[model samples]
Target: MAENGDNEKMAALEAKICHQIEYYFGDFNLPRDKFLKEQIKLDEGWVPLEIMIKFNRLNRLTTDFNVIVEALSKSKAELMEISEDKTKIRRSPSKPLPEVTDE
Candidate 1:
């Protein structure tokens, strides 16, 4: 293969996810906690940095169908393979997940 597209696509996906995440957090940077709390919902589909990285890895597929298939196969984040780095993977599933090709 000319390149490890999986990695390349994953990098792009990571960039997109980071941008989105930055936006997500920036939206919460308001001085007033009440407004932040009112607009932000971290209950579900919300992923932190570490989790987002793993999420990209586990679902580094070329297509959405494949991503769905892989995600469905694993279902839970705990079952997925991840690095032993200090970062902890704690967050929801949806969390503005990037598209497979993007991620």
Candidate 2:
């Protein structure tokens, strides 16, 4: 529910922040894992992933980057899917699965 002028200001801030990230980190490259690991190794305190994604132009948002910018500004955590029951989740292992039989 941003007003016309407010939208403009948000856009301006988004540009400035994104520009600062790019200025320091340079353009983003992939696979994203390498970029993240390298960035952390260089300076873990540099920026959060949400801001980094927006700065790299990789955020899935179709329109205004300000939406995400505002979210981070408000300290909103990134959306993720997690199960309420952690033990129900099964993680992959390196070895092949063995047959399971009723005890």
Candidate 3:
């Protein structure tokens, strides 16, 4: 049926994405199969931003994991803004924040 064909197509796309990741990060011994499954799950579902915000607030994460998670959630400009908050006022400027781009 059409559903089976659609499933096959999705599986092919997943394999392709996994292969691309493997090719790009082969040196790191990345988990290609796990990555493929996770990517598929990500494509299929949405995790609420509200839940993420609550989780972040509840967890007193001050380790490297926090660093990675925070970086993933925020942009380089936001990181800079935090750094530039020399006074640690907690309140940032009302104006729009700068755009963060990958260099």
Per-residue CA lDDT of candidate 3, range 7-47, in tens?
Answer: 45543443333232223123232233343234225632222
lDDT of each: 0.34, 0.36, 0.30
Higher-ranked by lDDT: 1 or 2? 2
For model 3, the superposed segments whose C-alpha errors exceed 4 Å read 1-5, 28-103
lDDT for residue 70 in candidate 2, whole number 0-100: 46
What's the candidate order when arranged by decreasing lDDT? Answer: 2, 1, 3
> Where does candidate 2 stray beyond 4 Å?
1-32, 48-67, 78-103
TM-score of 3: 0.22
Which pairs of residues collide in model 3?
none
lDDT digits (tens) for residues 42-98 of candidate 1: 543222333333345333433243343233233433332222332222223234333
Task: Give candidate 1 regions above 4 Å deviation.
Answer: 1-6, 27-103
lDDT of 2 by residue, 1-103 (tens): 7555545666555545444333333322212335444544554223344445554454543224344344433332222111232111111223233333447
Q: State residue 74's C-alpha deviation in candidate 1, in Å.
A: 23
Clashing pairs in 1: 10-103, 13-102, 13-103, 45-94, 45-95
Total clashes for model 2: 0
